[model samples]
Target chain A: GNSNSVSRITREGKKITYKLNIMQQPKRARACGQKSHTDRRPVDPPPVIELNIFESDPHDDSNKTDITFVYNANFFLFATLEPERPSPVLTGVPVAGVAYLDKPNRAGYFIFPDLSVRNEGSYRFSFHLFEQIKDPKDATPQEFLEFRLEVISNPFIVYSAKKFPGLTT
Target chain B: GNSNSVSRITREGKKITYKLNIMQQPKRARACGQGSKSHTDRRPVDPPPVIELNIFESDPHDDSNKTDITFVYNANFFLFATLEPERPVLTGVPVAGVAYLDKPNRAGYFIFPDLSVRNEGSYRFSFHLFEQIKDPKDATPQEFLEFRLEVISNPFIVYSAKKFPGLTT
Candidate 1:
């Protein structure tokens, strides 16, 4: 049941080999594949998870070097500002869940971890490419590949925290 | 060379299909939120460079809080400092993240590596932004940008070179 290939349950030495891609199984509907207890999950994966924005206290400036955005992020980026520049469009935060990886799991694609940025302006991210449907909600969101990423917001915060008036009162 | 909707053009160097919805203007561009054409050549838009990571024996209220790390950057402006670890797939390992002060051939806030011999957990650094704009096209592209950061000490002192001393030679 290889289907194309890319399967590794998990490995440690010689540089990690934890794969899971035989089409990432999970296509139940024969009465939720004969389950019980009010089934309610599998509605995830729609959150494409992407927003990778972290200024997480860039040492503070006036506050807002962008201090939050990222839990797994791979592409929940969106911004529209520039009606002549006034500041009004922004929303990005995908990467919601996958608490644990590696299992009988398989399908392809997995990247998360490596995030940091202090913001400045112009931010957009897109690369949408999803297809492995046997019913991932009937999937169909492919630009296949195209991307945008611009973040130029740093109103000002070059690590300025000096207001010592006698070692402070 | 259109192997189906812009596939592999310039052998993976200049793949252009002329696809456009309208967006493209970052050529030789320099700051634009605080503006960075050096503000049209009068110059004065250099501020996004501040990093600090220290660990020469931390004592998290005592428990086993470790030590032996030290990284700093800002060299007053910016130009060189690479101290990598946590590499997923970075093939820029020319000489393995150089950063020296008294004869690493460079100068300033870059003196790390020798963490009692490395290996405790989490590490990242790759900052090099300064003087190098031979061409994005003429002039107006200076912020060089190549910052990779992962500021996690994970309870610090993972480096165990103990003794009363042994955080290393």
Candidate 2:
């Protein structure tokens, strides 16, 4: 039944006016400094950001797992091997952070903000599924996975103005 | 008194004829690869030759050291430096082995036909020292200082090819 009772709000108790402040997202994209001779542009090639979960010692063959990335830009990013079927499982929540290179070619992407856990230490992260289906026989209908993400970390600063000679601060 | 003398001997018992094979210095210059970017080239710049050297532990540290360069193609090269004096140490030498990148800068002149080396390290190298210097300093005759160059134990290969892909074999 379509009724106005669901949309009606009682304002008899409080006389305070609510102010709604809306802001638009900025359109300025950051640029990388290193000039490449080839056509390997990062903006053009939007590769899938895969979060690798490793054991304490990477050299040891015993420990290995796949960690899922549950968030992006403070929003929950879902994952699915295929398009549709049913919701597979819920993974970890997304955290705010970005990737950066400390040295030449050495890059590390973190997921924490201020007091967040640094990716430098050894840890394990994974997306576990309840329905055990290794190889799904049906190729028609696929499955979907839902995950939540939170803004917990900040992006690492790569190119510093101080390091370079000619740059505007 | 300098005089050309020819000895003639009459065949009494046996006549002997002597043949001398003299090896003269090559008359062509060697080529090298071009650099990616230079201060002068605003438009398309010529490629520069790539020179590779291996420093042995026992090598000296002076400017008089000479290293043999083998190029991929035939080129003409003159060796000079930005020493205290403006005079060129080594003039045009015909070299065969590598190729030259593009035209060298005003400061960097050609040196040696195929290869050249100084006894010291951390010194500026150029193909043209004669033209680079404008006002010569009277205090220092040689614009560049003379030092012993470190000797390379391994054979260094210079490429005349525009680009060398991988590490030297």
Candidate 3:
């Protein structure tokens, strides 16, 4: 049994399969703007999103698909006048690193871990799902096909502490 | 007295100035995805986000910046097994219309009204403030500038009722 995969159950007490979905999206963030600070903690902390895997086929876990989150984000500075924009290609991963989702239970929400972005600007995420091919002859060993159950998260901004909006320092 | 502006106060009961902030963060929201239902209620209701305008300079409302919200939100479809993606510029405003903030009294919280988004995806908002230009030569012209007091709200997701997570239709 794959630990990361999700299964379902019906009210009639039969085993079932289910689809994956996004339950919650991330919160607004503050970038790690302070370069000279003594503490190692981030200037602005990361946000947590959630996932849900619920009721599907009442038969065996037929539609049970393994899922994980993959994300891409972009950001820009806060300036009074429109400045030259940063290329999405040039922008590296803004967070310190990847994180894990909490809760292994399939019937409720799966809480995604927090992420600490290092720069400032706006950001959004695209959640992805995949299914493995059943037949070896039809698919290559390294091939993994995408599933249709996907989600795009709400866009949130990462503001630098120095140029934070609405506050006079 | 300008009505839209905010003022501040000190512990000693002197009139003062202050800053604006997010007092109560918005809760998660559900987008309007059901197309055929006759009743006008949103399948998943919109959430309420709040702002705070509290203690400022006691001398006068010197930093009494007039603030309004400006937003740019984005969403994408939930596709299984990798599909063609949509462009950012082609997307339109997802909500039924713009909404108003509910409060005039400064030194306390200002509650943002509810919003009904028609699309299914994630979204966030940017809260903006502006300062009007004074000292016009003949008082017949106009000028304005963005204040540094800005905020980015947390992200939220909108899911179709037919495809809602963990729910058996």
Candidate 4:
């Protein structure tokens, strides 16, 4: 005989109904933002890895800040090291910084720099969509804002330039 | 007439003597932060391309805003397309955004993302070191500060992921 009940309710006694799904997990390092590394190919194709946002309540007219895409919304992208992973600290790395969103398709994509400065290792992507703070004084440098949505991507490996063999044919 | 003399005097009849030098020019793309893509390989390798600052007057005690690094000096990095290149417009691309500096070595490095999003073309990197704005109200989203230093990298080529061949061994 066992009884366990766990639930998260908002202040208004309603469940948090926003959800994010990782549609395509990244395959490996040096693949982010590279058109050739991606499986999809069309004119202006979407990124190799795509994340989608889904809202549960379609009927709600008011009080929909959490689920709906708020104006001035920003999506922060970061790479987190595996195990005991802390908030992303490695700035200026691949798949990091402000991720652009496809509002019409409810998809998101991150731009990649030429190369990464982080050490080679296993890591996961952390996506955080937050309401943009109009005032700089109220925001932390390179940090997600309050009242935000978040999701983590599947694990992937990073490798050094020489160590990372080119993608298979 | 052959009588043309040129002179530039600051508001206070002073001279602007700050200078930057390109120590190492990148051989090709996919090399911004990739250690193996660089030629210099010490304990911790510097980026393939290196930019150094050389201040003319080291003894000026005060009013060195134009030459010396300000308290919160942020070096903005950008990739500009060649010929009639405008201020960087590709937000999520390789070798773009904030570049880190080595104050002790007077060198700079830009941590790259895994790849780039811009289309294949010839481009150059533009580096701007500006005074970090304290107030958000006074700063544009991605523009440089009022007081700043700038440099442009040698022209380089960008290739599509599929068309780009691997670097020569």
For every prediction, compared with the true complex, DockQ reads 0.02, 0.01, 0.01, 0.02
lDDT of 2 by residue, A1-169 (tens): 1100001111232111111111111111122333331222111212112122222222444543322221111111111111011111111222222343333222223321111111122211211111111223311102221121111111221121233445432
Each prediction's TM-score versus the true structure: 0.19, 0.12, 0.29, 0.31
What TM-score, to 2 decimal places, does chain A of model 2 have? Answer: 0.17
**B1-169 per-residue lDDT for model 4 (tens digits):** 1011111233444443435455554334432322343223211212344555433322235744444442233333232111112221122223223344556554333333322213446655544332334444323224222323445566656443344456632
Per-residue lDDT for B1-169 in model 1, tens only?
Answer: 1011111123324222211110111111121222243123321112212232222333436535433322222211222322234421111111112233433222223222211212334333333222112234312211232111222111112232235544543
Candidate 3 structure quality by residue, lDDT tens digits, B1-169: 0112333333454453335565555445555444445126553223455555443333335435433322111111110111111111012111121222344443334444544555666555444332222333211102222132344455556565566556764
Worst 10 residues of 4 chain B by lDDT: B80-89
Our model 1 lands, by Cα RMSD against the true structure, at 27.4
**CAPRI-style class, candidate 3:** incorrect
For residue B140, give model 1's deviation from the true position in Å: 42
Instruction: List residue ranges in candidate 2 displaced over 4 A.
Output: A1-34, A37-142, A148-152, A158-169, B1-169
The model with the greater DockQ, 2 or 4, is 4
Candidate 3 vs candidate 4: the DockQ winner is 4
Instruction: Please estimate how well model 3 matches the true structure, expressed as its whole-model Cα lDDT.
Output: 0.35
Chain A TM-score relative to the true structure, per candidate: 0.17, 0.17, 0.39, 0.42
- Given candidate 3, what's the lDDT at residue A94? 23
Q: How many residue pairs clash in each candidate?
A: 27, 76, 20, 5
